[PDB]
Amino acid sequence: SVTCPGGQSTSNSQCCVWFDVLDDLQTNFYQGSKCESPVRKILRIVFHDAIGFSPALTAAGQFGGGGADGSIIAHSNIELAFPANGGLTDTIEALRAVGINHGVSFGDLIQFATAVGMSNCPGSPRLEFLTGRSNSSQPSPPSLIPGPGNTVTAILDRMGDAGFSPDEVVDLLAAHSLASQEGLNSAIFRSPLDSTPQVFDTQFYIETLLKGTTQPGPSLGFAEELSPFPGEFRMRSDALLARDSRTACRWQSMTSSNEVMGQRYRAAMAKMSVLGFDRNALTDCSDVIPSAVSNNAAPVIPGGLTVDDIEVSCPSEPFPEIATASGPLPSLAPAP
Ligand code: HEM
Ligand SMILES: *[C@@H]1O[C@H](CO)[C@@H](O[C@@H]2O[C@H](CO)[C@@H](O)[C@H](O)[C@H]2NC(C)=O)[C@H](O)[C@H]1NC(C)=O
Ligand SMILES: O=C(NO)c1ccccc1
Ligand SMILES: [Ca+2]
Ligand SMILES: [Ca+2]
């Protein structure tokens, strides 16, 4: 086969350097293959790098962004000044050093680190990994990243211009199952968006549908909504997307099966990874990506709440039978 210097077998010669950056990222960036803040920050970075792509700007004669081109690292001096890119500098610098030291393009490195980071989180699918994106990039145009205070129409139009259907926008948001916020309400730093910030599961879709009952911090932050229990943060765009008629039925369908959720998320991420590129010009090195440990827990409505506490918003499909839990209402600790 093509046997890499380390004895691993792979598809193509070009995949062998990625076994060295795999070891470096797992030992150093991810602190011993952990699923903590570095993974959550890299997931926010892959979205902010790739979504700087706009066919509408190109059509009007303007540069519309190179997509998944690593421009957020090569042109960090301009892209990290954008409102949406706060809290990312330290992760960007860490990634810059790995890219330089290994001689790989910045666009490829961000896609690789997302696939490897997710493999550290129980329940994750194995994401596709393609190599060969040119290292040359121009700065992304401003105002192409969706914000938590935007209306559902605004988010759907931005995402549609980039190439995503309403269903794929709901599918991409499965990444909020491994998420917290740091900059919307700094008083409750790293408050999780679902009760399992370290497990890639369906809890995010279930819990954003529950009635907002609780104010988790001393005041409300930017685009903050009432949440279902102490310690969980709910942002306005997630609350609105769960309830809007254009996205509500896809959101409800994501609540009962981790297997369907993983499959849909893997497909939407593969599409996002080549925005600005032709995937037929890239080399497939997906065999370098290791498997995640499986998640054996079933979907649940936490802490004694029942289906009467969820605000069913898909008028055509009845809400799935999800297991209920006993005990009092949970209070979530900060995400690690
Ligand atoms: C409709 C578009 C989306 C909006 C409006 C949005 C907005 C946000 C906001 C405001 C935060 C909190 C940032 C902070 O204050 O620390 C957040 C966190 C996060 N988002 Fe999104 N997001 C969206 C889509 C996505 C997508 C598509 C992905 C990736 C596939 C993603 C991955 C993450 C992750 C993993 C975090 C957690 C970061 C951490 O814990 O440090 N988001 N998002
Ligand atoms: C990809 O392009 C960037 C430049 O945009 C290169 O990054 C520079 O690399 C040099 C030498 O390795 C460093 O001293 C600079 O500080 C880097 N600049 C930035 C903005 O990071 C990078 O080397 C290129 N990588 C490859 C494989 O060609
Ligand atoms: O992460 C964001 N969008 O993905 C974001 C965060 C803060 C403000 C605006 C946008
Ligand atoms: Ca980019
Ligand atoms: Ca989760």
Swiss-Prot record:
CDD domains recorded: ligninase (cd00692)
Q: Can you name a GO cellular component term?
A: extracellular region
Q: Report the cofactor remark.
A: Binds 2 calcium ions per subunit.
The set of disulfide-linked cysteines is 4-16, 15-285, 35-121, 249-314
Q: EC number(s) of the enzyme?
A: 1.11.1.7
Give the sugar-modified residues.
Answer: 135
Task: Report residues binding heme b.
Answer: 176
Name the cofactor(s): Ca(2+); heme b
- Catalyzed reactions per annotation: 2 a phenolic donor + H2O2 = 2 a phenolic radical donor + 2 H2O
Keyword Secreted among UniProt keywords: yes
* Record-stated family: Belongs to the peroxidase family. Ligninase subfamily.
Q: What is the name listed in the Swiss-Prot or TrEMBL entry for this protein?
A: Peroxidase
Which organism is the protein's source?
Arthromyces ramosus
